[PDB]
Design a binder for this molecule. Sequence first.
Ligand SMILES: CCOc1cncc(-c2ccc(C(=O)NC3(c4csc(NS(=O)(=O)C5CC5)n4)CC3)nc2)n1
Ligand SMILES: CCOc1cncc(-c2ccc(C(=O)NC3(c4csc(NS(=O)(=O)C5CC5)n4)CC3)nc2)n1
Ligand SMILES: CCOc1cncc(-c2ccc(C(=O)NC3(c4csc(NS(=O)(=O)C5CC5)n4)CC3)nc2)n1
Ligand SMILES: O=c1ccn([C@@H]2O[C@H](COP(=O)(O)OP(=O)(O)OP(=O)(O)O)[C@@H](O)[C@H]2O)c(=O)[nH]1
Ligand SMILES: O=c1ccn([C@@H]2O[C@H](COP(=O)(O)OP(=O)(O)OP(=O)(O)O)[C@@H](O)[C@H]2O)c(=O)[nH]1
Ligand SMILES: O=c1ccn([C@@H]2O[C@H](COP(=O)(O)OP(=O)(O)OP(=O)(O)O)[C@@H](O)[C@H]2O)c(=O)[nH]1
Ligand SMILES: NC(=O)CC[C@H](N)C(=O)O
Ligand SMILES: NC(=O)CC[C@H](N)C(=O)O
Ligand SMILES: NC(=O)CC[C@H](N)C(=O)O
Ligand SMILES: [Mg+2]
Ligand SMILES: [Mg+2]
Ligand SMILES: [Mg+2]
Lengths: 540, 540, 540
Amino acid sequence: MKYILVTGGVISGIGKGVIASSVGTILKSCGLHVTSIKIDPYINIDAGTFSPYEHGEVFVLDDGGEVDLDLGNYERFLDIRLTKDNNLTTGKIYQYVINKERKGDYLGKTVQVVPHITDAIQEWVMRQALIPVDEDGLEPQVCVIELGGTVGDIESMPFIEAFRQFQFKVKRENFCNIHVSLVPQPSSTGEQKTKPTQNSVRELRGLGLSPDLVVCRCSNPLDTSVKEKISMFCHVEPEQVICVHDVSSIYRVPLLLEEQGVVDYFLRRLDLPLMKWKEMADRYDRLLETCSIALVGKYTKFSDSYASVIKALEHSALAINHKLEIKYIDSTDLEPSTLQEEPVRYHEAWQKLCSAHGVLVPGGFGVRGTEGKIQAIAWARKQKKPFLGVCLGMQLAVVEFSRNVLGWQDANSTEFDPKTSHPVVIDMPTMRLGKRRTLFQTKNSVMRKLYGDTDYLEERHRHRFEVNPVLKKCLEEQGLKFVGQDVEGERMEIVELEDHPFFVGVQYHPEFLSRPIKPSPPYFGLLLASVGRLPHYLQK
Amino acid sequence: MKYILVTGGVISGIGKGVIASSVGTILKSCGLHVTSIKIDPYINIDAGTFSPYEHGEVFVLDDGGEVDLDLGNYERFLDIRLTKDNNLTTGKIYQYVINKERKGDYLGKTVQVVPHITDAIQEWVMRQALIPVDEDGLEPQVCVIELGGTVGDIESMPFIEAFRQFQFKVKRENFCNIHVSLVPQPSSTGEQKTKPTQNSVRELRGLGLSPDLVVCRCSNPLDTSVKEKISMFCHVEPEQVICVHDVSSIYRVPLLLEEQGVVDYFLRRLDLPLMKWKEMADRYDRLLETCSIALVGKYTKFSDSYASVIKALEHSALAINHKLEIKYIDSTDLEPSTLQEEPVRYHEAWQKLCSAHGVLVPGGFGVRGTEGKIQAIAWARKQKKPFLGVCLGMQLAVVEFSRNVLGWQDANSTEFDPKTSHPVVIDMPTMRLGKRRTLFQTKNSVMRKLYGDTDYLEERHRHRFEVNPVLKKCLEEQGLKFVGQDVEGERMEIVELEDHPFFVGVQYHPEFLSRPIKPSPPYFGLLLASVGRLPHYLQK
Amino acid sequence: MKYILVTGGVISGIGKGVIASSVGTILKSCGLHVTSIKIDPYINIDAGTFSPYEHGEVFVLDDGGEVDLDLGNYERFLDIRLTKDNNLTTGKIYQYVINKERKGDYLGKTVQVVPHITDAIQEWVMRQALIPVDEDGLEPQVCVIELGGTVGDIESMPFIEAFRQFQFKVKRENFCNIHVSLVPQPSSTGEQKTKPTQNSVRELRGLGLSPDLVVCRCSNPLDTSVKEKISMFCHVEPEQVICVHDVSSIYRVPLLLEEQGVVDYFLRRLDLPLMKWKEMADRYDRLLETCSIALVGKYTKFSDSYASVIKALEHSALAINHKLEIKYIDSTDLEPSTLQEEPVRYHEAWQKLCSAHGVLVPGGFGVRGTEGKIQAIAWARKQKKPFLGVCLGMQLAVVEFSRNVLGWQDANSTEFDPKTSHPVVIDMPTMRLGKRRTLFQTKNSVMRKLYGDTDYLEERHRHRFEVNPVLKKCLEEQGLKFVGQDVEGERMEIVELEDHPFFVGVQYHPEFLSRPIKPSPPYFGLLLASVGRLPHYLQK
Ligand SMILES: CCOc1cncc(-c2ccc(C(=O)NC3(c4csc(NS(=O)(=O)C5CC5)n4)CC3)nc2)n1
Ligand SMILES: CCOc1cncc(-c2ccc(C(=O)NC3(c4csc(NS(=O)(=O)C5CC5)n4)CC3)nc2)n1
Ligand SMILES: CCOc1cncc(-c2ccc(C(=O)NC3(c4csc(NS(=O)(=O)C5CC5)n4)CC3)nc2)n1
Ligand SMILES: O=c1ccn([C@@H]2O[C@H](COP(=O)(O)OP(=O)(O)OP(=O)(O)O)[C@@H](O)[C@H]2O)c(=O)[nH]1
Ligand SMILES: O=c1ccn([C@@H]2O[C@H](COP(=O)(O)OP(=O)(O)OP(=O)(O)O)[C@@H](O)[C@H]2O)c(=O)[nH]1
Ligand SMILES: O=c1ccn([C@@H]2O[C@H](COP(=O)(O)OP(=O)(O)OP(=O)(O)O)[C@@H](O)[C@H]2O)c(=O)[nH]1
Ligand SMILES: NC(=O)CC[C@H](N)C(=O)O
Ligand SMILES: NC(=O)CC[C@H](N)C(=O)O
Ligand SMILES: NC(=O)CC[C@H](N)C(=O)O
Ligand SMILES: [Mg+2]
Ligand SMILES: [Mg+2]
Ligand SMILES: [Mg+2]
């Protein structure tokens, strides 16, 4: 097994996740089976505790692992399926060691950070690197480990110490360290600043790792004198100093690393034996036709709260050869209390919603913005604007429908209004979480045709609340149709509505299975419908 | 609440525990209710996982807390009773925070070392400092926290960071830091070396604590030039530089701190309002009469494996106004395989055993040295040498007795020989651990008279194995007498033998309740018997 | 004496110099006599070794100190006159201590960094803080010390250690630390990043200084959540977290600190008792009329190479109530070899030069771009465009004049062409450096009238080369006039030319004496002439 440790220097958020993923897709293009691990130095066991505001969205794996969105970057760049233990945490490691201690497995010896935590990290990394994540079922050849946080974080210390030991346990032909750093360019003096990078590399070396590539997150391309200064003060060759500058699309990021000889460096160093990315980028840079989707979100205060949702829309948009204008709406703007309190942002949000071709209502938990989602679904239903409801957006659409077409003005989810006389959405447990099979109940469903005319579908879930089986037939009588159901029949997993071009609720998360080469069918159908090309697509 | 943090500088083992305890007994003599906390930066939840070779003996508290021997130093210097949570560990803290995270109590925020672990440490210290440990039932006024390990240990970092925050949360009149350091005196150049102390204080200050006293563990009294150099290079007044040099007895250690104005410093700094130690020391330095006890131990490879046992013997010896020669015997030396393999150490151990006045067989777990304990008990029974069997030594004495006086040559504990046809000691559960009540079953018992003629006794246990109730009457028929029993009658907790000056088995651990002013009655009876003064004592 | 230490966090160049100067001008407006010290942790004794590309221009003091441009910021914000020893360096300190050691002054003791270098720094700072730098001749009340570099620089370590000692030697009412840090705002995630600031403050605290204000260099105004996160993770009150964001002019920077209560904080902390800046800013933001000056420079590759020159132009521009467009030209672009090699940048530079109202030829040393300066002066003379030649630009103008009006095609400075038969500029020594007196030789000189009709002038010099006294009368015959001469008459210090609105050479550096309220008369005359208002000005 070859190991590449990607460490972060000055700040999080400098695209270290897409660099790690690009390094992997580079090595995948070299014919290698590549796996990846994310180390998150937080004490949290999983991302299931977090809001979408903490680290961005909680990404969901087949096994029901609620994990960091960098695992979604790995899956989206590498076409692999990961498990819970590919997201390593301080919580996982300390609990492992504590449980092992209580069981007596450390044989009455004093359990310490070094060795016992640092050994546990190495054990975990070796253990997990050998697990087939590629759908081929083959053992990986390279494991790209991203160490989250910065190298100066107190939490990162045991992981860096573990990797310091690891580079002697595993040989130098099997271990490489990449350091992703920030090079500021202040508007005062106009120079690109090497100082934080040399300080960060000095910290890294003080912890016993020497960076084998230093990757500068730079806005503009690197000055020769600055690349020279980095080679000097970070004590590496010019060959080892990469600048990943701003480029036109994500699709240029592997190309930019390839151009800088990162491919050649790894093949050489690790003793080893991108035209798709080129043509995706070249098509993206030549888009003229434009589509707009209203993203009527709860978490819209931070864009990364809907990261994979946006990625799935962008896959779908590029696949239909259109540019995309995602109209990010805070759903609390559409709620009538904002009409009395701050009518400016109400009418801005409604202007955005009215001017979008399609409506996306993504997932979420809790009451805030739910009536704004219902407002947007009402608009979408009445005006016959293409609609995708994802999880919460399916649940709220079934509610919205009943509030109109059954007159159930009291109706809601039991999550929001438990004292309703029409609990059309009810708790049906813990969380239905990870991959399950949905069965298609009707050949005439638009979603079955988009899902390749398959009789079943396997998709990733993260829900407690389901549509009420008692009220099902009252809804379904009125030209709603629960076309996708669970294997038990008890859970309504996809819904369509008659006499509308595309009004679809999906109870799962299609966005987690979306790849550029294979856009998630509900998001694709939405994009197709928003351009009026869905009938043409279905006819072909 | 006033807090004193005692940090360790260069090494563990430089008497930081007895300094922390002496600081406490000083403040207790100032009229304050003093409690103490031990922070052990290990990942172990408790000391119950350890051998006696790791950190010395596992000390046991009333609540059944298996803890570090520094808690025993606290109890022995302060006359307090501690609980489990007075021994803080990294395991305890991380598990607390992880459980709290899984329960959702951190509200979807990223749980980090700073703040969440460092807050948890402060919470714990404040929480536990308010708990009455003094038998008076009053709230403490001072909490002495000993930080175990060294300040440069990776494990100590969150605790020092917690205390860095704490000194601003709690005010400077309520927080003081003592740093216990080593000053080497090499035989090469003869100078006392300040270098490790200034480096250690520099590390401590780099972590944001400034030492308010620097306590030099010095062999010889400190040179004026060296005390000057410490005041300079550790950036403190000469007033703040203590040397705790080698002195004649433990009883001189509080006096030596008192003499150096540590009393005055604390009273001043913490905005607050030893003749017993003097007379104990003065009596100790004037002992002429000498008694010898054979300590026939399993763990005798390291002396601190029987720390509180030795302390109890020394209490008892000083109380009878005799000097003590503890003949530390490795019990594997008395086992006949050593007679064939290495007869020199066999005859050395037997020479020691034969030349002792009394025999002590302390506790332990596992087979190694158990037949050597049985050998020593056989000697003690036959030669009528005063015998104290503690826990294992009670169990093995009941076995030894049966092997002779019932002819049960096969007999043992089920722990050692489960395939015996005479399991005279059997498992009777988990561990009977912490304080329970024993009831005295006979007025004529020597042990009842030593325990003040009380009908009951409360003592600290740590055993799974008990004497077999079925075989009880076969043993008791032959002039053995199980004078102390549990409240249920099922468990035999003290045994005596007829026609011997003092042959006592106790199933508990008397050594944990031993204080200088109140020597544990079984160890006192042993010492009295070994001098032949036990009849005279009982007659009075 | 009150001391304020301004430390740099993440990078140099984030305006720490103008923050230190603004803190000083704030305290000056509070009625205090303020001095300042710049510590440059480089081993260089002075800035006289440097090119203008290293740290920006070499600023010159009255005493002939060649120093960092931050001393010029101090003089320009505070209206003080500094000396050599207000620029402290590692070179100065180590040489001081070494010389003192060789003299035996350390009394046979081992001279170390701590104490002897760190004491020397404290000695120097106390010594120099008491020196009257205010033209009032009064002793300072506050000393603002800027520590150059970053806090993580190896070179900064003794200075931070010195200041760590200093805050106990000098009391807390007399010492304050400000930390100027960078808060990045990446275009990826859009968040303002606290991480480098908390890491930098953690480093600072590891070296024993706690920041009393943390000053965030932010592009945009600080988010409340980010200011909160800084207060948490940098362990200071929200009161202590300043953001110095991008603002319309330099004149807003003291106002922005005032608004954030920095005034109040210092008055409180240091136990002490801006309408000009407001009206300068308000006038600057209301400029409509625009003037352009061609800056035909050698060092124009980096703008800060001509820092005080640009400042003097901007003073002059604002004083005449015009906006300024400085047309920064690399003089090597105007040299005919660029016409053959790269004619695009030749014609760009010439287009800039032709389209400017006035021409500035600043100072420099060495041959590169000197013929381009002569090209620009030829243009300025012939086209009668307002000309200011500063030092090199005076020397080259005398040369240019002789090349035309005396036909001396071979003529140059001896610095450039020593083998000329017309050395019209010659070496006349070392460097004439610092303040000297020039005497005005003619009442009818435009420069005498601009300099208040004074018979003498005292200005700051930095030249070896002078105009040749033998060739003087050949030049002066032709309607050149050396109106300003040295007290010895041997050195030609100001030259004017007849039949031109403003063609002035000054041999000194007027830019170092320029203040916003008192623009340097040669730069003012240039700006006036470039608008055609110079006759009107002289008439009044
Ligand atoms: C160190 C990185 O440096 C730089 C430098 N310059 C630019 C970028 C950059 C970063 C993110 C983005 C981005 O997110 N773009 C979108 C998208 C579509 S598809 C996808 N990602 S994906 O599904 O994994 C697929 C690839 C396998 N992203 C439209 C939403 N676009 C540009 N990154
Ligand atoms: C920083 C310490 O520096 C120095 C300097 N010089 C000497 C010692 C020193 C350390 C330990 C010992 C020791 O262990 N002695 C014994 C004993 C009897 S009673 C008891 N401790 S006790 O029960 O808690 C009771 C007091 C409340 N210990 C005989 C076994 N004797 C001397 N310590
Ligand atoms: C931490 C600083 O943060 C920020 C935030 N936003 C903006 C600026 C900012 C920095 C520098 C400049 C600047 O250099 N401007 C000029 C000028 C004229 S006069 C003079 N300085 S001066 O002569 O000393 C006089 C004052 C006493 N400078 C025109 C050349 N303008 C804006 N600085
Ligand atoms: O990729 C990852 C994974 C985990 N984490 C972890 O999240 C926690 C926060 O680490 P950040 O770098 O987000 O720091 P911060 O929020 O204190 O500061 P700014 O964002 O304002 O710059 C730390 O515990 C870190 O290890 C990341 O930062 N990034
Ligand atoms: O071999 C050498 C050479 C030089 N020096 C130098 O002498 C100075 C003192 O270094 P020391 O190690 O003697 O330290 P100290 O006097 O502060 O402390 P103790 O002796 O009490 O332990 C330091 O500047 C060091 O580099 C030596 O210590 N030893
Ligand atoms: O204000 C000052 C004074 C002095 N110096 C000193 O200049 C030297 C360089 O310190 P810099 O911070 O300029 O670092 P660098 O050139 O290595 O990196 P970048 O500019 O690319 O970020 C160091 O010795 C420092 O102390 C400054 O940086 N700034
Ligand atoms: N994933 C989601 O969007 C959650 C929807 C809803 N709160 C549920 O628990 O079913
Ligand atoms: N505390 C001891 O000495 C233990 C004795 C024996 N191993 C038991 O478990 O009972
Ligand atoms: N200060 C300057 O511009 C220097 C001019 C010229 N090189 C001299 O030494 O005189
Ligand atoms: Mg963050
Ligand atoms: Mg020495
Ligand atoms: Mg630099």
